[PDB]
Amino acid sequence: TVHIDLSALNPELVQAVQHVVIGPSSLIVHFNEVIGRGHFGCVYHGTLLKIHCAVKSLNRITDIGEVSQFLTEGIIMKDFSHPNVLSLLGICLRSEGSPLVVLPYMKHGDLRNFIRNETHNPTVKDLIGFGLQVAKGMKFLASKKFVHRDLAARNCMLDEKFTVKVADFGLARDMYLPVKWMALESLQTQKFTTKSDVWSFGVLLWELMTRGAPPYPDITVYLLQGRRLLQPEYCPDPLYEVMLKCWHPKAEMRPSFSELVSRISAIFSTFIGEHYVHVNATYVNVK
């Protein structure tokens, strides 16, 4: 029931965020066309003046400090511009602290559900291509000193051109611990680095080549027995070698995302789209 007067915001911040703000005359939220809802708020189809967007409606913010943190995150995220990173089209902050986050619409949804869908017919080349795109997006994010912390196929989106966008970060968080994607040292210390993102990226590559099986179909104990994820049936040997490098027990010895983009670009280039990938019978329906 808390009232908030947004004129209490620091004028310098309000001026600084103006380039991120979308006016009400520029946005139609299609309220009867819901993409998804839950504790995070709600996601609707939108039109931005026309361009098809997803509009996340957040829970009301009634503290000026929290509003200011939201606006600041908007300014920062606006400049995280890269072809393989989900962009922020803009924000709105209506009366009584009712926020909207406006994102590009992703025709093909998240990458995990996309590859799992039996009516889709990916090749090895396609799946490696998706992984390469994710590596490019992560190379960018790492260059901004940004650590994702939940890199996974479910947190990447796919647009109408089959371009992968690394998502679930910044103001695009909460649109729907991840121990099975975490590096050993993160399991042990709760600390995340770009090198622990590289570990997660190896698991994401495994998700791609299995067409979205759950990893390890108790994890610290299991890993410390001397174990890794098994080579997927359709995973090329050089790509499995890259996965093992991503899971190096020494964080400093893992490849950088720059090295990953280089290595995977080379592997990708050798394929011509001849090899169709199918699910492993022992992984189908496993949660």
226 is in an annotated binding site: no
Do both 154 and 229 map to the same domain? Answer: yes
In this structure, the answer to whether residues 57 and 119 fall within a common structural domain is no
Bridge partners, 90 (sequence order):
102
d(CA 82, CA 73): 17
Q: How far are the Cα atoms of 54, 146, 203, 239 from residue 253, in angstroms, in the given order?
A: 39, 20, 17, 17
Instruction: Determine if residue 145 is labeled as part of a ligand binding site.
Output: no
Q: Which of 75, 105, 135 is the last residue of a domain?
A: 105
**What CATH number does the domain containing 231 carry?**
1.10.510.10
Judge if 168 and 44 occupy the same domain: no
Catalytic residues, which ones? 150
Residue carrying structure tokens 């994102």: 103
Provide the phi-psi class of 279: left if phi over 0, else alpha when psi is between -120 and 50, else beta. Answer: beta
Pair (94, 205) in one structural domain? no
Is 35 part of any known ligand binding site? yes
Within a domain: 6: no
| Under 8 Å between Cβ of 128 and 118 | no
Domain count, the chain: 2
H helix runs in 27-146, sequence order:
64-78, 111-116, 124-143
| Secondary structure class of 229 (helix, strand, coil) | coil
Taking a C-beta distance cutoff of 8 angstroms, is the pair 152, 178 a contact?
Answer: yes
* Same domain, yes or no: 258 and 133: yes
What is the domain-level CATH number for residue 88? 3.30.200.20
CA–CA dist 41, 34 (Å, integer): 11
Same domain for 84 and 22, yes or no, is yes
192 is annotated as contributing to ligand binding: no
Q: Does 153 lie in the same domain as 20? A: no
Task: Report the alpha-carbon distance of residue 130 to residue 122 in Å, rounded.
Answer: 10
Among 105, 127, 147, the domain-final residue is: 105
Do 271 and 160 belong to one domain? yes
Residues 37 and 142 in one domain: no
Contact 115, 153 (CB under 8 A): yes
Q: What is the CA radius of gyration of the chain?
A: 20
Q: What span, in angstroms and rounded, lies between the C-alpha atoms of 87 and 104?
A: 7
**Contact 146/140 with Cβ under 8 angstroms?**
no
Looking at the structure, tell me whether residues 156 and 274 fall in a common domain.
yes
Asked, for residue 173, whether it belongs to a domain, the answer is yes
Angstrom distance (rounded) from CA 30 to CA 112: 26
Distances (CA, A) of 204 to 55, 207, 242, 248, 287: 27, 5, 12, 15, 16
Determined by which method? X-ray
Is 36 annotated in a binding site? The answer is yes
Tokens of 182: 């975490």
- What's the rounded Cα separation, in Å, for the pair 183 and 32? 42
In terms of residue numbers, what domain contains 66? 12-105
Task: Classify residue 1: in a domain, yes or no.
Answer: no
Q: Which residues of 205-237 are buried (b: 16+ CB within 10 A; e: fewer)?
A: bbbbbbbbbebbeeeeeebeeeebbebbebbbe
Longest alpha-carbon distance in the chain: 61
Token pair recorded at residue 90: 């803009």
Domain match, 82 and 146 both: no
Domain boundary among 65, 82, 105: 105
41, 57 in Cβ contact below 8 A?
yes
